[PDB]
């Protein structure tokens, strides 16, 4: 449970994070459906423990740059992501993105927009240069 | 003139503190946006003539050869589902602009 | 003045964890990129507004 896995229940091969379901499934109720008419839960055929399926963590990724002309240095914003989900993103569990020079951290800043990496958070306010969202912007400066 | 103004701002609060529906022009926008995403999630449940609406039911059953004829149906119907949504949103964005 | 900004992963909506679907969806060309270019243009405009 609580792991990105290729589960297979009664012939149904699926990718998701299995988790003990708090839903009060009735004895007859086998699988659990989400509003999207999708499988949000399922019954383990062997040991009866209703399982909530949730998809493995994802989001948009956005790259902030003073422009190639100014410099090659960039900062990365992980959309809608808490900082703790970037230590979770490890090559061991290969992600679509093969690159991972940002998981080195130390500058992982949390924006309401999402997890921002490679940009240094500061206390000074400025006019918005590159807009990140939820009141945050980024810029290339000394 | 000041007592009139102070009484007129008083009624403004009263009205907003009373009726449920005064911001109907703004709720509509929220209602339209949500309805379009809830309609787009409902499209996923449609077969479009495939043996199932679920790719895992097709892949687990039909072999790649028999599967592609079913997968293409789901691709064709979903692609339009997305195009419809994005055309509705591009038209609706011009109303908001 | 504005509306909800949305982004829609055309691969995850159309292909639910299906590489076969992906390799089939690639036969339509730029559609998915054009859809994201449209929704990004709507989303940038909500901040302009």
């Amino acid at each position: 449970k609580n792991k990105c896995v290729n589960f297979n229940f009664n012939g149904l091969t699926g990718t998701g994070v299995l988790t003990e379901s708090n839903k009060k499934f009735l004895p007859f109720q086998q699988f659990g459906r989400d509003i999207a008419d999708t499988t949000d839960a399922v019954r383990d055929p062997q040991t009866l423990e209703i399982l909530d399926i949730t998809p493995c963590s994802f989001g948009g990724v956005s790259v902030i740059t003073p422009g190639t002309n100014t410099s090659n240095q960039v900062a990365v914003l992980y959309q809608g992501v808490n900082c703790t989900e970037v230590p979770v993103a490890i090559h061991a569990d290969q992600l679509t993105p093969t690159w991972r020079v940002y998981s080195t951290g130390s500058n992982v800043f949390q924006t309401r927009a999402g997890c921002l990496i490679g940009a240094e958070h500061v206390n000074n306010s400025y006019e918005c240069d590159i807009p990140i969202g939820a009141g945050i912007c980024a810029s290339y400066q000394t | 003139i000041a007592n009139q103004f102070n009484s007129a701002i008083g009624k403004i609060q009263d009205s907003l503190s009373s009726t449920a529906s005064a911001l109907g022009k703004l709720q509509d926008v929220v209602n339209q946006n949500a309805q379009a995403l809830n309609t787009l999630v409902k499209q996923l449940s449609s077969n479009f003539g495939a043996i199932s609406s679920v790719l895992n039911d097709i892949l687990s059953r039909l072999d790649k050869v028999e599967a592609e004829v079913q997968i293409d149906r789901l691709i064709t119907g979903r692609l339009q589902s997305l195009q419809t949504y994005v055309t509705q949103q591009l038209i609706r964005a011009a109303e908001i602009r | 003045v504005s509306m909800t900004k949305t982004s829609v992963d055309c691969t995850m909506y159309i292909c639910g964890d299906s590489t076969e679907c992906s390799n089939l969806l690639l036969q339509y060309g730029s559609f998915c990129t054009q859809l994201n270019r449209a929704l990004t243009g709507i989303a940038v405009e909500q901040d302009k507004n």
């Binding site: 999207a36 009141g135 | 709720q27 929220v30 | 909800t4 829609v8 055309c10 989303a43 901040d47």
Partner: peptide, 29 residues
């Protein structure tokens, strides 16, 4: 005005935040 969504996310449909927060809109106002 009061602003499903989780299921939409499970299907690649995400909402992005506005650049100006409701506090920044209230400071301009």
């Amino acid at each position: 005005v009061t602003l499903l969504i989780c299921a939409q996310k499970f299907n690649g449909l995400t909402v992005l935040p506005p650049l100006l927060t409701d506090e920044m809109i209230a400071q301009y106002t």
